[PDB]
Amino acid sequence: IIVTQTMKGLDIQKVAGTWYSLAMAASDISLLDAQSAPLRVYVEELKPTPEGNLEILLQKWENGECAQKKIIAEKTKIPAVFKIDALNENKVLVLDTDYKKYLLFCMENQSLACQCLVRTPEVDKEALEKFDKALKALPMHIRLAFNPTQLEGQCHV
Ligand X SMILES: CCCCOc1ccc(OCCCN2CCOCC2)cc1
CB of 107 to ligand X, least distance (A): 5
Shorter beta-carbon distance to ligand X: residue 99 or 121:
99
C-beta closer to a second copy: residue 2 or 144: 144
142 contacts which partner out of a second copy, ligand X, none, CB within 5 to 8 A by kind? a second copy
The span from the CA of 24 to the CA of 22, in Å, is 7
Residues that bind a second copy (CB under 8 A): 29, 33-35, 140-147
Report the SS3 class of residue 9: coil
Provide, rounded to whole angstroms, the least separation between the CB of residue 19 and ligand X.
8
In whole angstroms, give the CA distance from residue 106 to residue 6.
Answer: 10
Helices (H) and strands (E) in the chain, counts: 2, 10
d(CA 114, CA 94): 10
Site string for ligand X, 61-80 (x = CB under 6 A): --------x-x---------
155 lies in the binding site for ligand X (CB under 6 A):
no
Binding site for ligand X (CB under 6 A): 15, 41, 43, 46, 56, 58, 60, 69, 71, 84, 92, 94, 103, 105, 107
